[PDB]
Write a protein that binds this ligand. Structure first.
Ligand SMILES: CNC(=O)c1cc2c(s1)-c1ccccc1CC2
Ligand SMILES: *[C@@H]1O[C@H](CO)[C@@H](O)[C@H](O)[C@H]1NC(C)=O
Length: 356
């Protein structure tokens, strides 16, 4: 189990002003540290965050968090469940900022909610240095869904934080799971009123300014003010990072289809929707051609790395834990140890190892 620690700096808060925190399981015989960023969509205005506070309060507050949490998947310490990093120090950072880990504004008389996702990561890394992170050999910043996008938004800031604090030996790396989205056109137009069924562009646009969200520096200088929403999309922000980032992304992510307003009921799919789905898989495949460390199975699913059966899926005969191990080896063309694994078949579940 991972033990809950609320941030000693109580000025770094969740949405409702309650303190943020992190779950920790130390491994005294390891110099490898895995910091996982939880996901769970976001909210971009006062009245939509108010609704999130009624029925998703744990994603906005720490007042009801449990004292412990079970490490699953890549956060598991059993080698059977986690062949990759079972012996590493495990850190689970709950997502309680609703800002895709980008905000850096505190709750005041002008803000009903605090959006401090970017400062939460910074404060956790800071406070972990006194509990063993100072002697770390690799810091892997991982995350799923919104936490996956958060890795892309924060991995260079964490690396910049550690050098400026005098820890050049800590190799900061990123693992972004199911956070690689396309700002494509929906299959059927909808009215952007919520977070689930809104155009992925315009939702980020209003959120980033509601949050006062921050984006990585080189990406900010390319797109410049008013266009920082572009850096929330993997294929635009990834080329600007220097830190190594392994990208895990279903070719047919359920969250991607949701914001695209695609709903597979079970009826025979018409030509229009069939071409739309095949074109989506092709577009994602294209955005990953120049991503050397990637794992993209042709499945309709959502998230993977913290699921207990994340070992089952395979691309071209190689599992994700193996590809991540090969990635570790590449960072010390490997024989029989591939690191770029992207399916080429064009329909959901054409890979037989897809989750059922
Ligand atoms: C549990 N589902 C999530 O957490 C997220 C879903 C999406 C996210 S996060 C997203 C992130 C950046 C840009 C655009 C989007 C739209 C879809
Ligand atoms: C707490 O975090 C805030 C935001 O990063 C910072 O301004 C403040 O100095 C921190 N306080 C301490 C004691 O670290």
């Amino acid at each position: 189990d991972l033990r809950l620690h609320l941030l000693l700096n109580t000025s770094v808060t969740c949405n409702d002003g309650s303190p943020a925190g992190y779950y920790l399981k130390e491994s005294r015989g390891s110099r490898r540290w895995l910091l996982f960023l939880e996901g769970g969509w976001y909210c971009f205005n006062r009245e939509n965050c108010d609704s999130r506070y009624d029925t998703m309060r744990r994603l906005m507050s720490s007042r009801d968090w449990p004292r412990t949490r079970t490490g699953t998947g890549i956060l598991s310490s059993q080698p059977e469940e986690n062949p990759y990093w079972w012996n590493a120090n495990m850190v689970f950072i709950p997502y309680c900022s609703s800002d895709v880990w980008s905000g850096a504004s505190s709750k005041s008389e002008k803000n009903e909610y605090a959006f401090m996702g970017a400062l939460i990561i910074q404060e956790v890394v800071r406070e972990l240095l006194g509990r063993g992170l100072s002697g770390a050999k690799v810091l892997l910043l991982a995350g799923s869904s919104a936490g996956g996008t958060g890795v892309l938004l924060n991995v260079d800031r964490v690396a910049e934080q550690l050098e400026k604090l005098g820890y050049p030996a800590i190799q900061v790396r990123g693992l972004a799971d199911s956070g690689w989205f396309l700002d494509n056109k929906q299959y059927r137009h909808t009215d952007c009123v919520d977070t689930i069924t809104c155009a992925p562009t315009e939702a980020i646009r209003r959120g980033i300014r509601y949050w006062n969200g921050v984006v990585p520096e080189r990406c900010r200088r390319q797109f410049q003010e008013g266009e920082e929403w572009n850096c929330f999309f993997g294929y635009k922000v990834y080329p600007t990072l220097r830190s190594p980032v392994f990208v895990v992304q279903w070719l047919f992510d359920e969250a991607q289809l949701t914001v695209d307003n695609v709903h597979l009921t079970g009826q025979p799919v018409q030509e229009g929707l069939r071409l739309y789905i095949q074109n989506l898989g092709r577009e994602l495949r294209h955005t990953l051609k120049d991503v050397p460390a990637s794992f993209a199975p042709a499945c309709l699913s959502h998230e993977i790395i913290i699921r207990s059966h994340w070992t089952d899926v395979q691309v071209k005969g190689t599992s994700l834990p193996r590809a991540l191990h090969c990635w570790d080896r590449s960072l010390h063309p490997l024989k029989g140890c591939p690191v770029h694994l992207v399916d080429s078949c064009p329909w959901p579940h054409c890979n037989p190892s897809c989750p059922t």
